Design a protein around this ligand. Structure first.
Ligand SMILES: Nc1ncnc2c1ncn2[C@@H]1O[C@H](COP(=O)(O)OP(=O)(O)NP(=O)(O)O)[C@@H](O)[C@H]1O
Ligand SMILES: Nc1ncnc2c1ncn2[C@@H]1O[C@H](COP(=O)(O)OP(=O)(O)OP(=O)(O)O)[C@@H](O)[C@H]1O
Ligand SMILES: Nc1ncnc2c1ncn2[C@@H]1O[C@H](COP(=O)(O)OP(=O)(O)O)[C@@H](O)[C@H]1O
Ligand SMILES: [Mg+2]
Lengths: 678, 1245
């Protein structure tokens, strides 16, 4: 801490784009350290200060230990020739697994062409295909031919049968059996165990996505008259790229990972073809105005891509994208596909009209792609990496002690002891009375305290049993043994999850959130016992610390309705963000804390786009007012309030005013939102 | 097949002859086998193998011929593919008995429920729906000219389509006048609505609006003049005003449905026209008009299946003129408009449809509405344990061949094998459909085909398939590419409520909808989660329909009230000045509050006050029914209150029960045990008896005690004969009405736990069909007089399908206060003689007040005086109430229910007054004085309080309750410090006396030192036999619990055998014991005798009370639904005093039968807890271990007997006996079950 404070050149390191290459010397050493010692200390420092770069730092550690070219061979094109020739036996099938929507049979066809080997390819999609595959395999196993089976994940039981068959054969030396499938859990475990697995993924980037889309579409389809058609296809391709690459940056890019696959693209192409054939009626040219823009916008907003979208906010985002792209101004030479790329530069529409011009423009695109191409902020990348960074460490925690079995209970004893010490011993239950039951707030907090106390007893008993097992007092039961397996690896047990939480969370974060929630519950219970239910209005409740804050919002609405004798329908919500200490709450105003604002900064109760990942909102006053017939101002943006960073659950929506003349659409493209908890 | 139908001979003569010649040979072979059934004798029959191979070959050939013939008949008329094999055989075989065909049309046609026929059944004149709406054919189908079933059924389908098109033409021609008119005469509009069917009415309205808007948009034509669209909107609003005025009037049901459909369509038309005007659409080819569904009717087309064309964006469908009846229309929300748009886009692209979302979001109903809008037969396939696979290939072939839609509701719920097989079938069908879309394939000669059931089935283009899904998830990988998915996550509640409320004639609908919709979600969130609550959209729509009914009832009430006076009447004027919010809140309360738990009713009223401020629901006053309730309640010794009094909630609940019985034909009472649901129903029946002059009959059935086969009757697998079950017997008895049962009113009450297994057949009866179907093939129609009722402690194992069909009144435990039960007890004491038994039970009804019978017997006077002494302690804050509230805090091995303790206490007080009567009989010269009576009953009340409340607890907790009573009581208690109060008896004189005086010290023979089954008298034994006699005098079923070896079985046997009359039957229960054991025991010891009152079961020995010992009542295994069959059987016997002979299906009554059980505590592993409706009747005693004093006494007797062999060691008897006790007790203190499970000690050691 003192060294960090005294370092003048720390900030330039902390804001650097590649800090891992120049980590400062801060650790104290009694003796000079080895290169690997310096590497691990730099790894710890980068984890502490810049987790977004952790993976990069991790790579350096590998390069410090296993060689510079160690990881490089994977960063290359797959050389299936030598591997299948030498490292694969004839009876071992080559399982080519792909992520959904990606087909890898082209690689096998290319290899068969290169080696000059006859290959028989069969698609397994019906009962007939099983007979064809059996006949082809019986022929090739004797004659040593090559067999390929396409999309075998559709037949799990037949794959088990094929594995059993393969275990018994005596194949010819030149026989090879390729099985192309999509990554699904229904593939048999034994077949994966008894096969050579090759995982194929698409190369990330808008450029490769557009190239794949253009290659997949036949040339004659795009070349059909009128000449404007190709330009629309380019826009469509660009659109299909922008939504797809954005799925990498979820939950920021989209609320959830939708399956925007090639089927949507083919449906969109069919829609475009039908509408242009109807409008043009064979004319070699049609004006840009005559293009049915409304039909395309509505259909790809509701039918093609919007059908999969269930969140209203993602539907709004899709509407913004379609309205920005599909318009007559797309045919202007000055149109900008993505504005303020990297904050200074822009991407212009190609000025050509033929397919070849658009394909050349795509091929000539820069290789350096940032999130600003998709409308996201650049720091979205900095978010994604650190997520993957955590995804690294947690994964290694699942590897730390299933491989290693030497002492694990010696450390688990201390860990469970600390976890027991952190959690409070009890949660006092609220005293229901005749007077306070009329308060909706007391009902909500009583339900919360009941659930929290029950789950508290559950966790405390489980941890006590774990500590007893680590001391030898208690034997390892099946449930207990599973619990030690989860806790040692940092996995959250299923027995502990009874309120909505982020998926993939370790146990320390869960118990820390537990401690915060129980402390909040204790505080509100003490307030209720001391001052009755009347103090439940003046207490500042962190919506993150509640197991169902939507019930709290409804309870505040009901309390305002009861106090002011207004109908519940006639009440509407407004938000006031106050930085002043001691801001008095009106009779219809309720305090909240712990809110975080993703993608914006609030000054004077007005939003402004910011590059910060998240900003802590101060005491937020939720105020219920009679719904006045007020026109929706153009400078008003309706942000969501998601439960947590995963954005799986939406609590409610908040209308905020825009500080500057910024387009509200920029807030939708940026994915600005509010989180009850980080 | 060949003897069930007599017409099969004429259809298949050659196969009939071959089967005759085969049956003769097979019968001969089977006769030969029957004359020598040994396996080796059969094998050595000459040429048996070749003969059986020949028979197999020929039978296979005839079965193949029959299958080919039935497939030919199916293909001739493709709708038969929706019909099973036996049903198709019934249809063709009964070709000349057309009436038998009438039930099968609901499977083949969309709406045709029957065919109207000439009086001689030779010409078909039309079709009819379920609602009775009829379409009369323009050209009748002559069966005589087309005798074959398939031919005239095809002609019926053709004429249905032709006549529907020809009537749609006239309907459009007539409605064009209203389309172009500035004002619509209501009489002419109503006449037009009556003249034509609902389907054609809505289609005519849609066609007129679409053509008018098309002509308008053509006329504006780029000039920007919006006058024509304003004219269209004006006409639509005029029609809406006319319909709103007409729907407030009283209308027939069919015309009301037509008006509701027209309003629902015209609201959407008004919204669309307003949107077009706002958007300034100025060309017919703009997308804002093309994206709205449009109707183009071309009467000039000669073909009748390409006249109406329905268009939406790209898609250009034709209306298949399939009669749909009066279907339920859908409020065209923007979400349903999106669904229609996407689904029609998918159909135009030949893809399948997948509306996925949470449950109850309109997915399958929206798909059905879309299919019905285009006139195509939709066929929803449920996917929840009713998924008939064996017809599914046949159904798919039928859909492909005829042209018809198919929607899979919750396709996720199919299991993995089922999912994969159906996925493959739908994949093949979808590929066959997608083959249409290619342009190169010329359709002049294009016989598309699909591989189904190993045959090439032709696929029509009109067909489609839809797959509703529930996320949490994805579609199967086979069909992910072929199906377009749509997220129907959240329907528009507000607009649906708005349109429906406007359809019922409410002046204000926007505010009411915007209030009621958030209120339902508020109730869903705030109220405690219970299975029976249902705040989905179906409940909301039903509530709004009920609100409309209440509004119309109020209009008629005001109208008739004014008409009885001198006034001028107008329906609209009356409807103008009414509160709509009062009607809506009244409907909401009337529909919800009966289902509400007592904990949730004040929360619901708070929410209702919040959403509906300043509006309160005053309950409708039923003066006559309340007066009859008062009369019957005083007659039956029950409290009555006028609301917010002692017993107001119970009166309200019985009134709600009357309301639900009036509304529904099936209902349930789902309170906890001991809430007065059965008493409330009995009082209601006996009150309606007086009110309406209609005789009330009750048929109470315990469904779980009886097997399902006996309940519903079972078909004999051979030697075909039908044996009516009990429920079927009752239904047939009322239907026949031999004794005029139709005149009388009869209620069937299933007093037992509801389970899925025995309610499957009852689902058809409880549904709107009101039809019991049996495996015999008989269809019993429930008459209106029957009302199938249910009593359940809970509905934990009740299917939602059963709960939905039935109304419900939740009888929360705080409907019967302690004061009501105490008043019932004290009222029963003052007027029921306690010794006269059952002969004078009938005389209770002879006297309406029993004047001059105040001194019916000295027993009545004694028990009346006793009630007078006991009244101060039974008050609302008296000794008994405080004692019960304190006892509820104490833990008891068995669950402590209120009515169990109260019944135990009442039985003990009954025995107290019986003891006083005994003393009076034994002292005829001077009977009991009031001072001694006061002292005796005051002490007995405390004694009975202890032994009723803490009789289930340990000795320490009995002492605790004794201390509490000593604190709060005014009655003097024993003045000995270190003795518990329970150790003292109350003598016949008022003063206490220790139990130790009444236990003799006996000497046992050396012959039986360890097996004196006559129990050595000890303190616990004398206490427990005293209680045994007290609770056997009332015939209550005693039960005793305690740890193993405590001595309950011996004490029970000795006490029972001490009585002279009691005849003990020792039955031991096990995990496999059933009602059959008790029935067998009754057949052994007892016998059935017929009497004028009815069949009576009685012991063979005259003047002897047969008592059944059930040594382990707990041990019988529970079913999958947590109920012991034998326990329920015993419960119905002890509570109803009888049971139903299943073989005869008739009620029989026990006369001198009792039950007395023993148990171990339910904490032990092999045991189970007993039903709370059963534990209410039984008083449970806890026989703990004897302890040091009792053990010393018992084994002093045993060792004094044992040492008699050797006469020099008698002096060492007593010193030894202490040692045997002392060490034993020390072991019992040092080693416990916690250290090891088998460290258990008892007096058996
Ligand atoms: N007052 C008594 N006089 C004599 N023997 C007694 C007495 N009380 C208990 N016992 C003894 O206690 C033992 C248990 O007798 P028993 O009545 O069979 O217990 P139990 O509770 O019925 N066993 P179970 O029916 O399985 O619960 C026997 O050895 C009896 O002799
Ligand atoms: N209106 C009433 N006033 C006073 N006492 C009543 C009233 N209704 C019922 N009781 C008392 O409550 C007892 C239980 O009521 P009821 O016989 O209807 O049983 P139940 O609630 O259906 O219970 P179970 O689950 O045991 O069948 C009745 O025997 C009677 O003692
Ligand atoms: N848009 C709507 N208009 C009118 N009624 C609707 C609408 N959406 C849903 N409903 C009602 O809600 C119920 C939902 O049930 P259903 O559609 O059969 O299954 P699910 O909705 O669970 O797929 C239907 O009975 C229907 O009457
Ligand atoms: Mg009952």
């Amino acid at each position: 801490i003192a060294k960090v404070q005294a370092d003048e050149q720390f900030g330039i390191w902390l804001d650097s784009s590649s800090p891992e290459q120049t980590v400062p010397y801060l650790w104290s050493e009694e003796t000079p350290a080895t290169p690997i010692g310096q590497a691990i200390h730099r790894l710890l420092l980068i984890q502490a200060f810049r987790p977004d770069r952790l993976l990069a730092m991790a790579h350096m550690f590998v390069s410090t230990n296993l060689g510079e070219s160690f990881m490089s061979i994977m960063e290359q094109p797959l050389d299936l020739t030598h591997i299948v020739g030498t490292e694969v036996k004839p009876n071992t099938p080559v399982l080519m697994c792909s992520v959904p929507g990606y087909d890898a049979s082209g690689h096998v066809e290319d290899l068969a062409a290169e080696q000059n080997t006859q290959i028989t390819s069969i698609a397994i999609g019906s009962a007939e295909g099983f007979n064809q595959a059996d006949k082809a395999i019986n022929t090739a196993v004797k004659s040593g031919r090559w067999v390929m089976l396409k999309n075998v994940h559709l037949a799990p039981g037949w794959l088990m049968q094929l594995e059993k068959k393969l275990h018994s054969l005596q194949p010819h030396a030149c026989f090879r059996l390729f099985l192309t499938m999509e990554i699904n859990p229904k593939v048999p475990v034994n077949l994966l165990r008894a096969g050579r697995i090759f995982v194929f993924e698409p190369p990330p980037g808008v450029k490769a996505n557009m190239l794949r889309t253009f290659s997949s579409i036949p040339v004659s389809r795009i070349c059909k008259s009128p000449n404007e058609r190709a330009r629309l296809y380019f826009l469509l391709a660009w659109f299909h790229a922008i939504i797809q690459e954005r799925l990498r940056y979820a939950p920021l890019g989209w609320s959830k990972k939708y399956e925007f696959g090639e089927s949507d693209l083919r449906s969109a192409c069919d829609t475009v073809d039908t509408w242009l054939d109807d409008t043009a009626k064979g004319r070699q040219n049609i004006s840009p105005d005559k293009i049915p823009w409304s039909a395309l916008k509505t259909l790809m907003a509701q039918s093609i891509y919007g059908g999969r979208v269930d969140n209203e906010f993602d539907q709004r985002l899709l509407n913004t994208f379609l309205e920005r792209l599909f318009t007559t101004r797309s045919f202007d030479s000055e149109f900008k596909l993505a504005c303020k790329v990297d904050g200074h530069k822009d991407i212009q529409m190609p000025d050509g009209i033929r397919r070849e011009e658009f394909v050349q423009w795509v091929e000539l695109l820069p290789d350096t792609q940032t999130p600003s191409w998709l409308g996201l902020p650049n720091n979205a990348e900095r978010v994604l990496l650190t997520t993957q960074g955590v995804d690294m460490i947690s994964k290694m925690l699942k590897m730390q002690m299933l491989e290693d079995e030497d002492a694990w209970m010696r450390t688990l004893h201390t860990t469970a002891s600390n976890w027991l010490h952190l959690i409070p011993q009890t949660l006092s239950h609220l005293k229901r009375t005749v007077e306070n039951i009329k308060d909706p707030l007391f009902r909500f907090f009583e339900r919360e305290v009941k659930m929290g106390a029950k789950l508290l007893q559950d966790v405390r008993q489980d941890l006590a049993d774990v500590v007893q097992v680590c001391e030898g007092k208690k034997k390892q039961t099946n449930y207990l043994r599973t619990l030690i397996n989860e806790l040692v690896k940092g996995i959250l047990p299923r027995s502990w999850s009874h309120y909505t939480v982020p998926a993939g969370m370790t146990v320390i974060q869960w118990v820390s959130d537990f401690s915060e929630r129980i402390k909040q519950l204790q505080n509100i219970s003490l307030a209720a016992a001391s001052g009755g239910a009347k103090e439940l209005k003046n207490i500042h409740v962190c919506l993150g610390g509640l197991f169902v804050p939507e019930a709290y919002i409804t309870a505040t609405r009901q309390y305002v309705a009861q106090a002011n004798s207004w109908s519940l329908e006639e009440l509407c919500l407004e938000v006031n963000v106050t930085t002043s200490q001691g801001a008095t709450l009106d009779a219809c105003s309720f305090g909240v804390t712990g809110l975080k604002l993703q993608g914006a900064t609030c000054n004077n109760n007005k939003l402004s786009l910011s590059n910060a990942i998240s900003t802590a909102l101060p005491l937020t006053q939720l105020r219920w007012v009679k719904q006045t017939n007020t026109e929706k101002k153009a400078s008003v943006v309706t942000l969501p309030v998601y439960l947590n960073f995963t954005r799986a659950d939406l609590i409610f929506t908040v209308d905020f005013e825009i500080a500057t003349k910024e387009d509200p659409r920029s807030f939708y493209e940026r994915g600005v939102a509010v989180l009850c908890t980080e | 097949i060949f003897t069930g139908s007599a017409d099969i001979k004429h259809l298949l003569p050659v196969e009939t002859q071959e089967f005759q010649s085969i049956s003769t040979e097979f019968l001969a072979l089977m006769k030969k086998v029957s004359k020598s059934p040994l396996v080796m004798d059969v094998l050595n029959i000459q040429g048996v193998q070749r003969s059986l191979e020949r028979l197999a070959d020929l039978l296979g050939e005839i079965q193949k011929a029959l299958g080919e013939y039935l497939e030919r008949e199916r293909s001739s008329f493709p709708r038969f593919y929706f019909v099973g094999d036996e049903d198709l055989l019934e249809i063709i075989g009964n070709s000349k008995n057309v009436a038998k065909l009438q039930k099968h049309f609901k499977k083949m046609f969309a709406g045709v429920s029957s065919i109207i026929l000439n009086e001689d059944n030779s010409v078909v004149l039309g079709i009819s729906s379920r609602e009775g709406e009829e379409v009369m054919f323009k050209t009748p189908v002559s069966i005589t000219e087309h005798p074959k079933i398939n031919e005239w059924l095809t002609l019926v389908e053709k004429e249905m389509r032709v006549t529907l098109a020809k009537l749609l033409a006239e309907s459009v021609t007539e409605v064009e006048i209203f389309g172009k008119a500035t004002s619509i005469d209501p009489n002419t509009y109503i006449t037009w609505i009556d003249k034509y069917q609902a389907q054609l009415v809505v289609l005519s309205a849609q066609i007129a609006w679409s053509e008018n808007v098309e002509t308008a948009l053509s006329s504006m034509g780029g000039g920007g003049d919006a006058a024509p669209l304003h004219s269209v909107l004006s006409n639509v609003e005029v029609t809406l005003n006319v319909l709103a005025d007409s729907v407030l009037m009283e209308q027939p049901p069919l015309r009301r449905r037509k008006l509701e459909h027209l309003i629902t369509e015209l609201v959407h038309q008004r919204d669309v026209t307003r949107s077009l005007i706002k958007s300034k659409i100025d060309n017919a080819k703009s997308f804002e008009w093309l994206s709205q569904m449009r109707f183009y009717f071309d009467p000039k087309q000669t073909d009748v299946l390409q006249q109406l064309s329905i268009q939406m964006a790209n898609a250009k469908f034709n209306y298949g003129f399939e009669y749909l009846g009066v279907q339920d229309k859908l409020v065209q929300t923007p979400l349903t408009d999106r669904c229609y748009l996407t689904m029609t886009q998918a159909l135009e692209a030949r893809l399948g449809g997948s509306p996925f979302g949470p449950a109850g979001t309109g997915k399958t109903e929206s798909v059905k509405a879309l299919g019905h809008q285009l006139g195509r037969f939709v066929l929803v396939f449920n996917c929840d344990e009713t998924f008939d696979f064996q017809a599914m290939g046949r159904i798919f072939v039928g859909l492909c061949q005829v042209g018809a839609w198919g929607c899979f509701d919750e396709f996720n719920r199919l299991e993995e094998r089922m999912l994969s097989a159906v996925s493959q079938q739908v994949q093949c069908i979808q590929e066959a459909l997608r083959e249409h879309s290619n342009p190169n394939y010329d359709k002049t000669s294009a016989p598309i085909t699909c591989e189904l059931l190993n045959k090439q089935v032709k696929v029509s283009p009109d067909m489609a398939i839809f797959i509703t899904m529930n996320p949490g998830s994805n579609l199967p990988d086979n069909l992910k590419k072929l199906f377009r998915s749509l997220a129907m996550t959240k329907p528009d509640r507000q607009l649906i409520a708005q349109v429906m409320l406007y359809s019922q004639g409410f002046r204000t609908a926007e505010v009411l909808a915007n209030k009621i919709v958030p209120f339902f979600k508020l109730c869903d969130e705030q109220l405690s989660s219970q299975s029976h609550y249902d705040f989905g959209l179906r409940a909301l729509k039903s509530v709004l329909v009920s609100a409309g009914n209440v509004k119309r009832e109020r209009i008629q009430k005001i109208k008739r009230e004014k008409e009885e006076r001198g006034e001028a009447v107008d329906e609209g004027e009356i409807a103008e000045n009414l509160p709509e919010q009062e009607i809506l809140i009244q409907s909401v309360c009337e529909t919800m509050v009966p289902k509400l738990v007592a904990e949730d009713i004040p929360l619901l009223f708070s929410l209702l006050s919040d959403v509906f401020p300043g509006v309160q629901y005053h309950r409708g006053e039923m003066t006559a029914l309340r007066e009859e309730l008062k009369k019957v309640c005083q007659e039956m010794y029950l409290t009555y209150g006028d609301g917010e009094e002692v017993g107001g909630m119970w009166v309200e609940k019985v009134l709600q029960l009357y309301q639900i019985t009036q509304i529904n034909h099936g209902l349930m009472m789902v309170g906890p045990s001991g809430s007065g649901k059965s008493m409330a129903w009995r009082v209601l029946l006996k009150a309606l008896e007086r009110l309406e002059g209609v005789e009330g009959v009750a048929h109470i059935i315990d469904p779980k005690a009886i097997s399902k086969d006996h309940l519903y009757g079972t078909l004999d697998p051979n030697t075909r004969e039908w044996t009516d079950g009990l429920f079927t017997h009752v239904l047939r008895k009322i239907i026949d009405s031999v004794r005029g049962e139709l005149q009388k009113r009869q209620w069937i009450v299933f007093d037992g736990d509801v389970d899925p297994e025995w309610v499957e057949n009852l689902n058809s009866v409880l549904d709107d069909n009101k039809l019991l179907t049996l495996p015999n093939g008989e269809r019993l129609s429930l008459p209106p007089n029957v009302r199938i009722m249910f009593e359940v402690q809970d509905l934990k194992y009740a299917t939602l399908a059963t709960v939905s069909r039935c109304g419900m009144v939740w009888f929360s435990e705080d409907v019967l206060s302690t004061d009501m039960i105490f008043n019932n007890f004290l009222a029963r004491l003052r007027s029921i003689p306690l010794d006269e038994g059952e002969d004078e039970a009938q005389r209770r009804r002879k006297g309406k007040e029993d004047e001059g019978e105040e001194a019916a017997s000295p027993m009545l006077q004694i028990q009346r005086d006793a009630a007078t002494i006991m009244q101060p302690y039974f008050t609302s804050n008296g000794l008994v109430t405080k004692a019960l509230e304190h006892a509820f805090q104490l833990e008891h091995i068995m669950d402590l229910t209120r009515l169990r303790c109260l019944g135990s206490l009442f039985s003990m007080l009954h025995q107290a007054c019986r003891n006083v009567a005994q003393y009076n009989a034994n002292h005829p010269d001077f009977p009991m004085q009031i001072e001694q009576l006061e002292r005796y009953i005051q002490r007995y009340l405390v004694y009975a309080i202890l032994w009723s409340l803490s009789g289930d607890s340990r000795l320490k907790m009995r002492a605790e309750l004794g201390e509490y009573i000593r604190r709060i009581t005014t009655v003097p208690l024993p003045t000995a410090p270190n003795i518990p109060i329970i150790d003292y008896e109350v003598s016949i004189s008022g003063e206490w006396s220790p139990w130790q005086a009444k236990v003799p010290q006996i000497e046992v023979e050396t012959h039986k030192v360890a097996a004196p089954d006559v129990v050595v008298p000890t303190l616990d034994t004398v206490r427990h036999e005293a209680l045994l006699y007290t609770w056997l005098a009332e015939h209550k079923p005693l039960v005793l619990c305690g740890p193993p070896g405590s001595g309950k079985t011996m004490t029970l046997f000795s006490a029972l055998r001490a009585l002279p009359d009691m005849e003990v039957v020792g039955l031991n229960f096990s995990s496999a014991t059933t009602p059959e054991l008790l029935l067998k025991t009754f057949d052994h010891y007892c016998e059935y005798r017929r009497t004028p009152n009815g069949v009576v079961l009685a012991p063979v020995q005259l003047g002897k009370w047969l008592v059944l010992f059930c040594d382990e009542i707990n041990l019988p295994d529970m079913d999958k639904y947590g109920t012991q069959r034998v326990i329920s059987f015993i419960r119905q016997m002890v509570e109803h005093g009888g049971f139903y002979r299943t073989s005869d299906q008739t009620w029989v009554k026990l006369e001198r039968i009792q039950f007395v059980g023993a148990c171990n505590p339910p904490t032990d592993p092999g045991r189970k807890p007993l039903s709370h409706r059963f534990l209410r009747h039984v008083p449970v005693v806890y026989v703990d271990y004897p302890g040091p004093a009792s053990l010393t006494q018992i084994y002093g007797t045993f060792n004094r007997a044992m040492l008699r062999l050797i006469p020099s060691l008698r002096t060492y008897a007593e010193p030894l006996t202490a040692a045997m006790v002392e060490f034993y007790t020390m072991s019992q203190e040092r080693f416990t079950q916690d250290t090891q499970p088998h460290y258990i000690y008892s007096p058996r050691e």
